[PDB]
Scaffold this motif. Sequence first.
Motif, PDB file in Angstrom:
ATOM      1  N   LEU B 189      30.421  38.824  37.636  1.00 18.99           N
ATOM      2  CA  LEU B 189      30.829  37.425  37.692  1.00 18.99           C
ATOM      3  C   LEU B 189      29.705  36.515  37.207  1.00 18.99           C
ATOM      4  N   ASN B 190      28.519  37.092  37.029  1.00 19.68           N
ATOM      5  CA  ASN B 190      27.410  36.389  36.396  1.00 19.68           C
ATOM      6  C   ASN B 190      27.757  35.998  34.959  1.00 19.68           C
ATOM      7  N   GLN B 191      28.694  36.728  34.356  1.00 18.31           N
ATOM      8  CA  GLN B 191      29.287  36.316  33.087  1.00 18.31           C
ATOM      9  C   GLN B 191      30.306  35.205  33.333  1.00 18.31           C
ATOM     10  N   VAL B 192      30.318  34.208  32.453  1.00 17.20           N
ATOM     11  CA  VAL B 192      31.209  33.054  32.580  1.00 17.20           C
ATOM     12  C   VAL B 192      32.674  33.397  32.269  1.00 17.20           C
ATOM     13  N   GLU B 193      32.874  34.285  31.298  1.00 18.24           N
ATOM     14  CA  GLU B 193      34.213  34.693  30.875  1.00 18.24           C
ATOM     15  C   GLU B 193      35.026  35.271  32.035  1.00 18.24           C
ATOM     16  N   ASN B 194      34.415  36.195  32.771  1.00 18.69           N
ATOM     17  CA  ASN B 194      35.044  36.787  33.946  1.00 18.69           C
ATOM     18  C   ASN B 194      35.425  35.728  34.979  1.00 18.69           C
ATOM     19  N   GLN B 195      34.551  34.738  35.154  1.00 14.02           N
ATOM     20  CA  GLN B 195      34.820  33.617  36.048  1.00 14.02           C
ATOM     21  C   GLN B 195      36.088  32.898  35.608  1.00 14.02           C
ATOM     22  N   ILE B 197      38.583  34.137  33.741  1.00 12.68           N
ATOM     23  CA  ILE B 197      39.697  35.054  33.991  1.00 12.68           C
ATOM     24  C   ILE B 197      40.163  34.989  35.447  1.00 12.68           C
ATOM     25  N   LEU B 198      39.215  35.168  36.364  1.00 13.36           N
ATOM     26  CA  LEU B 198      39.486  35.135  37.798  1.00 13.36           C
ATOM     27  C   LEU B 198      40.148  33.820  38.199  1.00 13.36           C
ATOM     28  N   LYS B 199      39.552  32.714  37.758  1.00 14.96           N
ATOM     29  CA  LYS B 199      40.059  31.384  38.069  1.00 14.96           C
ATOM     30  C   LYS B 199      41.502  31.231  37.600  1.00 14.96           C
ATOM     31  N   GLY B 200      41.803  31.756  36.413  1.00 16.34           N
ATOM     32  CA  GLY B 200      43.161  31.729  35.893  1.00 16.34           C
ATOM     33  C   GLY B 200      44.131  32.537  36.742  1.00 16.34           C
ATOM     34  N   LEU B 201      43.726  33.760  37.086  1.00 14.35           N
ATOM     35  CA  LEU B 201      44.526  34.643  37.934  1.00 14.35           C
ATOM     36  C   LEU B 201      44.896  33.943  39.245  1.00 14.35           C
ATOM     37  N   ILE B 202      43.875  33.454  39.945  1.00 16.48           N
ATOM     38  CA  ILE B 202      44.073  32.748  41.207  1.00 16.48           C
ATOM     39  C   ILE B 202      44.925  31.490  41.028  1.00 16.48           C
ATOM     40  N   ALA B 203      44.739  30.799  39.907  1.00 19.31           N
ATOM     41  CA  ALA B 203      45.500  29.588  39.610  1.00 19.31           C
ATOM     42  C   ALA B 203      46.998  29.875  39.504  1.00 19.31           C
TER      43      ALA B 203
END
Lengths: 251, 251
Positions: B189-195, B197-203
Motif C-alpha cells: 500500500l506504500n504504492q499509490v496505485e494500490n491505494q 484500487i482499494l479506495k475504488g473497491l471500497i467506494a
Amino acid sequence: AAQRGDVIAILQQALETNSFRLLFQPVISLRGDSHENYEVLLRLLNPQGQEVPPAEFLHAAKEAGLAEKIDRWVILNSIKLLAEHRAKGHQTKLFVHLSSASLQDPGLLPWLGVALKAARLPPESLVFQISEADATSYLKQAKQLTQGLATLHCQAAISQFGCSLNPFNALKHLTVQFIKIDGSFVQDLNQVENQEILKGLIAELHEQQKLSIVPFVESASVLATLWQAGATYIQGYYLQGPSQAMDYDFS
Amino acid sequence: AAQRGDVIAILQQALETNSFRLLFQPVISLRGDSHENYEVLLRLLNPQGQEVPPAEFLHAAKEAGLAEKIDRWVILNSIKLLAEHRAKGHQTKLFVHLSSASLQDPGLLPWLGVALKAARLPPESLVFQISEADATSYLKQAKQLTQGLATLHCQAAISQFGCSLNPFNALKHLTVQFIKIDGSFVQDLNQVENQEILKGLIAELHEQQKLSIVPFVESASVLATLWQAGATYIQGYYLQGPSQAMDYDFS
C-alpha cells in the motif's frame, strides 16, 4: 495470553535480533530419490513470547515492502543450517519459499551467487518454491529466475499448482523440476471422481517429467489414496508436522 | 519436538471430548456500529499437547467429510458463549465461518433455527462468513442459504472478496451485508496505485450499501491508510490477534 502488537515493528526488530524461528516439515518420497527433503517454514515470535499468526506477519512484510529482505534472511540461515547438516553425513534438500518481491528483483540471483559458494553448498541442494499465482502474474521474470537457478545448479518448484485457467501453459517456458499440487485437489477424497481428477493431473505432470508433490496427508488412508494417484512426493502431519529440528527418520 | 499424528482421528477424537479450542479476533468499527464484533476461529490440540496447524486439520476435515460436523460444533458453542456474554451485558456480534460442505447441506437452516430458538439468541446477532470462491462455486445454494439466513434474522459475509473475474456480479444474487476484502488488496500500500484500487473497491462496495471489512491492519500507519480508503470495519494484529477470550475493550 492474550495480546497484540505492531507486527511491522516486530519484523524490523527480528531482522536484527534474529528472533525469527525457522521450522521444517519433511517432504517424503514415494517414487523419487531417497534423499532428505524438508520444506522450511518461517514463524515469528512477538516480544512477549507467543508467536504471531503467519498470515498476519507475512502480510506485514508485504505492507512494509520488507518481503525480499526477509527472504534473504531465510535463504541465508537455511544454507548455514544446511552446511551444518550436509557436512554431517546427511544429504538433504531444502524447499525455500520465494515471494513475488524476491521473484521480481533481478539482484537476487547475483546476490545468491555470493552466498552458496561461501559455504561450498553441494549442487542441486536447494529448491526455491514460488506460488502458481506469482508464477503466472510475473511470468517473464519467473522464466529468467528459474533459468538463472539452473545455471547455479539450484532447483525450482511451483506450489499451489492446478488453479489457474490453464495451469500447464505456464510450464512451457520456465525450468521447474518439482510441482506442488494445490490442496484443493486433496479435498473431498472420499469421492471417486475427485481421486480420478487427481490421478489425471499427476499423470499429466508425469508426462512432462515433473515431480508431483501432494500436501496434506492426514491419515494412512489418505497416504494410500495418494500412492494410488501416483504422487512422486508427499507431505503431511500424519507423516510429520512442522518441527523445530530436521529430525525425521527417512528410513 | 517433534510433532506428528493421524489428524482425521484427532478430529473424530475432538468432536466429543470437545477438545476444540475456540479463538476470537475483534472486528474494529471505523464507520459502522458501536457493537462488539468478533470473528470466531478454530484451533485443534493434538493428544500430547501442542496445536496442529489449521491448514493441516481443515484439509483433514475436508478429506473425511467432517467439515459440516465441525461447522455445526462451532455454531453451537458460539451460540452458547454468545448467550453467556450477551446476557452478561455486552451486545456483541459473531462472524462464524461456513464451509462449502455446510453451504451445500439444506438441513443447515432448520437445524440452525432450532439451535437459535433453544437459546433465544437476539435478532441480527450472528454473521455467517463464506468465501467468495465458495459462493461463486455454488452460487444458487449460496443464494438460498443467504435468503434463508435473512428470515432467521441472521447476517451474511463474503470473505476473500475481489479476486474473481467480476466480483460484484455474484453479490447481486446474494443477501449479504458485510464484504470482507481479500488480503491481496492490502499488500504494498506504500504504492499509490494500490491505494487507488482499494479506495475504488471500497467506494463501489459503499455504493451497494455493503459494509467493507479490511484485514491485516499490521501497524498504526496501515490503519491510517485504510481509514483513508474508506473501510467501514478493520481487523488486524496491531489491533488484536486471535485471543482465547472476548476481552477486547471496544472503547
